[PDB]
Amino acid sequence: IEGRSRLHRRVVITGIGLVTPLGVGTHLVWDRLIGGESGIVSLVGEEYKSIPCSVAAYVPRGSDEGQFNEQNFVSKSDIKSMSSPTIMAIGAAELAMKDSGWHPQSEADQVATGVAIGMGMIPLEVVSETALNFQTKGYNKVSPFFVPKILVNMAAGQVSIRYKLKGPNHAVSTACTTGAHAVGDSFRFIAHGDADVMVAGGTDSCISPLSLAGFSRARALSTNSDPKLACRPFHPKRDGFVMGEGAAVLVLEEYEHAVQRRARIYAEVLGYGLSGDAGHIDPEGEGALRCMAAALKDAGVQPEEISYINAHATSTPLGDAAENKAIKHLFKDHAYALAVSSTKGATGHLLGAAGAVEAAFTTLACYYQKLPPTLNLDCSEPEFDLNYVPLKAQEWKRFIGLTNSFGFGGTNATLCIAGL
Amino acid sequence: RSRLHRRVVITGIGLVTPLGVGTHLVWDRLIGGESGIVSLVGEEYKSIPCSVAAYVPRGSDEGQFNEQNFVSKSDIKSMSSPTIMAIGAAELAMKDSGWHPQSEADQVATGVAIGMGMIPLEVVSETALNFQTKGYNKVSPFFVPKILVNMAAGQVSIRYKLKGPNHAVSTACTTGAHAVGDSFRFIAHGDADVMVAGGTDSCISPLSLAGFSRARALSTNSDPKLACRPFHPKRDGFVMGEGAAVLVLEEYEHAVQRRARIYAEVLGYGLSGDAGHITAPDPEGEGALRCMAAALKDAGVQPEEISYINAHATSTPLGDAAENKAIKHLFKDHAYALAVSSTKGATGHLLGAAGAVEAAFTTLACYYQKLPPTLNLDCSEPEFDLNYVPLKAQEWKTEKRFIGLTNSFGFGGTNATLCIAGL
Ligand SMILES: [N+]
Ligand SMILES: [N+]
């Protein structure tokens, strides 16, 4: 009546695929990130005069190495029935499986491999254009692919079909927290015995006048016209986030499964914490504290064992300060022994993909024992007195990291990830 | 390493459906063989092949949905129709459960997992027009919240002080089952002691119905009395419904200590992907077989112990047959000794809420040991030779444990099954 004990398995990360404003491809992206590079640029197009915002972080497109070329992954015929985020997700999943050396062929390997890829927001423009087409050209001009193009779970569905992944098929949609939940849920499915491998992550492409209008009106997007300075987490002059686009996918695998096939293992997922603010759609950051605490409890590790936090910090006056507070309250005097950085200066806020790209960055920090910098942080206010890895990457017991994702609607998640 | 896997029970249900509002009222009408499927009305729906749907009945009578009972007039303009229905369903579920967290400890011990299959499309297109015409300054600050899938779970959490795990899935027709299954796993794992779990969807509009008709998913039958008929020779697509279902899941000892009324125990949860087609089901039903088997394995139950299956069967030619094939394959000779029914003839297909409403029906089936019928099933092809509880409700008494399955299969080939049992 109190329950039964069951085997709870260890879970590792063996592959990473990245489609980001810093570029495409695992170690290329990590190099640029560590080298202090950024993908934030000025918005181009006449359609953007209607909005106060003038910057964003785009995925670089083209045929050079490190650029995104859709035609490498999908046919011209597929591009009509798939949204841009779905295409980005297929690219990232392909690169992740290649990075892992996992290409399931047998029925047993296919059924043992699932997919958990989330999306924060559906493609607004596709809905917008179809509505107008329906109203002016009639029913029979609506694409038969409209529904399959606009469902949140379609990226996970398409990756499953493309790579014949037949295990659990799951898609979360929790705004900025989306990518973190996808990795955590996958971790849990594997530990529980539902799958031996999970292809997990997040994707989003929300850069459009309407989307940016919506976010400008509902939250704080920076109005800074200088793309080199717009996004500055923890900085006195921070004034809102910068929208990015992209997809990040990780291959999670049961430990003995990985060892048996002699996979290269980046890191171990130790813990997963979740909480709700239950406040507003909190300057003390209580929700953030409870979520980090939950991840520590899940991992069975003490606060003093943590050496690195990849912060959610999106460059907002209230948000960055609340997270800083939650960190200080939880870690107390140990807060001064660890390092904290936000990589959003480099990628922008990738929304649905943010938690996944940052889980990948934390995974690589564990692997390389090196910390990506917080860009643009040349000074700080008294309350910001921690080591935020300002400007330049730093070299760095077991290496244990946390990565935080806090989303619209008060939904919070933290992942605890460690070196092996 | 081994870890404690706690037991999880259902202590409250709140239903907002085309059959009406209020869990036990809806159950009585379902068992009595009622349906909420009606004809569409208005020039707005001209030119679209589908002319039927299932609406939540609105008004101030018993069993009717009155928005004002749950959200204030000013709060309406800040949230979508699905969000409002989820708030209503959640309020009813927590009232049914007798769970209303007050202390910080009870608040942090209680989370929310409510999903949505699809955001109402009309807010996007209307806002787009408003933005193109009146400009930036007239775009609502609530537009983003209205189009985020996770906003139902967020609003329910704020409104009811739920500070535990805050989670939202969006897996089309499988949404509601995932929300319940994920909550089960969170409780069993120790992340929360109580979860407010379910699904909501309210997206019957010209554009949505045009979309699903173009994908060739919907019934083209103009007769609402006959349009939806799972397992029937003349089935020709599903009927879109709307609504919300919320269930209160709770750790077993937690429920016992407070003397909660316990409907049923959640035993198991299984998941799979067809990896076949983005909208069409695997004709072999291999995906369905796999998530049912996975549910039984999670539950520690043998096929021969299952007495009832609440089928996904939405009344499509290929879908219904593929599921029938999966049950026959998995259960073998025992397929003829269990009962299977689809309640979509009564509620329509509630999309994001379907897996949650049908988890609720399966739970009540366990509690009452009575099986809701498949409507409109007056005859069948030779391949449909099982007991589909045709037309009229059946009592299902056993001296052994009543154990049921509920299936949800969605676009994208995403499958889930829940295993729920009497106590
Ligand atoms: N993060
Ligand atoms: N079902």
Swiss-Prot record, chain A:
Catalytic site positions: 176, 312, 349
Tissue: Widely expressed. Higher expression in heart, skeletal muscle, liver and kidney which contain high levels of active mitochondria.
GO biological process, one term: short-chain fatty acid biosynthetic process
Enzyme class: transferase
The reaction(s) this protein catalyses: a fatty acyl-[ACP] + malonyl-[ACP] + H(+) = a 3-oxoacyl-[ACP] + holo-[ACP] + CO2; butanoyl-[ACP] + malonyl-[ACP] + H(+) = 3-oxohexanoyl-[ACP] + holo-[ACP] + CO2; hexanoyl-[ACP] + malonyl-[ACP] + H(+) = 3-oxooctanoyl-[ACP] + holo-[ACP] + CO2; octanoyl-[ACP] + malonyl-[ACP] + H(+) = 3-oxodecanoyl-[ACP] + holo-[ACP] + CO2
InterPro entries in the cross-refs: 3-oxoacyl-ACP_synth-2 (IPR017568), Beta-ketoacyl_synthase (IPR000794), Ketoacyl_synth_AS (IPR018201), Ketoacyl_synth_C (IPR014031), Ketoacyl_synth_N (IPR014030), PKS_Beta-ketoAc_synthase_dom (IPR020841), Thiolase-like (IPR016039)
SMART domains in UniProt: PKS_KS (SM00825)
EC annotation from Swiss-Prot or TrEMBL: 2.3.1.41
Entry keyword annotation includes Mitochondrion: yes
Positions bearing N6-succinyllysine: 76, 80, 141
Activity regulation, free text: Inhibited by cerulenin.
Alphabetical list of NCBIfam families matching this protein: fabF, PRK07314.1
Reported function: May play a role in the biosynthesis of lipoic acid as well as longer chain fatty acids required for optimal mitochondrial function.
Family: Belongs to the thiolase-like superfamily. Beta-ketoacyl-ACP synthases family.
Protein name per the record: 3-oxoacyl-[acyl-carrier-protein] synthase, mitochondrial
Swiss-Prot record, chain B:
Protein name (database record): 3-oxoacyl-[acyl-carrier-protein] synthase, mitochondrial
One GO term of the biological process aspect: acyl-CoA metabolic process
Gene Ontology cellular component list: cytosol; mitochondrial matrix; mitochondrion
Matching SMART domains: PKS_KS (SM00825)
Species: Homo sapiens (Human)
Modified residues (N6-succinyllysine): 73, 77, 138
Gene name as annotated: OXSM
Family: Belongs to the thiolase-like superfamily. Beta-ketoacyl-ACP synthases family.
Chief place where the protein resides: mitochondrion
Pathway given in the UniProt record: Lipid metabolism; fatty acid biosynthesis
Keyword tags: Acetylation, Acyltransferase, Fatty acid biosynthesis, Fatty acid metabolism, Lipid biosynthesis, Lipid metabolism, Mitochondrion, Transferase, Transit peptide
EC code: 2.3.1.41
Cell wall biogenesis/degradation among keywords: no
Annotated tissue distribution: Widely expressed. Higher expression in heart, skeletal muscle, liver and kidney which contain high levels of active mitochondria.
Known regulation of activity: Inhibited by cerulenin.
